[PDB]
Design a protein around this ligand. Structure first.
Ligand SMILES: [Zn+2]
Length: 42
């Protein structure tokens, strides 16, 4: 019951939403929500 608890301190951190990832690819699958990434139907 207490927000604000960063854990990992990874280099991969999206500035669009403010998230963190351990790998690069993992982040690539997230960009789909921000910028047109890979296929996503019409
Ligand atoms: Zn993001």
């Amino acid at each position: 019951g207490s927000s604000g608890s960063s854990g990992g301190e990874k280099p991969y951190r999206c500035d669009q939403c403010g998230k963190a990832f351990s790998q690069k690819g993992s982040l690539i699958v997230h960009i789909r929500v921000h910028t047109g990434s890979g296929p996503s139907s019409g």
